[PDB]
Amino acid sequence: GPSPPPYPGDDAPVEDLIRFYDNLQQYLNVVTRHRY
């Protein structure tokens, strides 16, 4: 949600990287309400 996403080091597996994408796009959509 509007929280910092867990960083699985330097190389995350693409599934969890997609999960990271979810949390990241959500976080950014919150802190910066603009479409990217």
Next chain:
Amino acid sequence: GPSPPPYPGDDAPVEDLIRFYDNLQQYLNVVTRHRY
């Protein structure tokens, strides 16, 4: 592009986090060609 994005530690400033979003969505769009 289709390369691993630079991780600015655990907390990145939202501008560079948006840049990270660009590289990340590009990377994911390459490795996993599906809309998210």
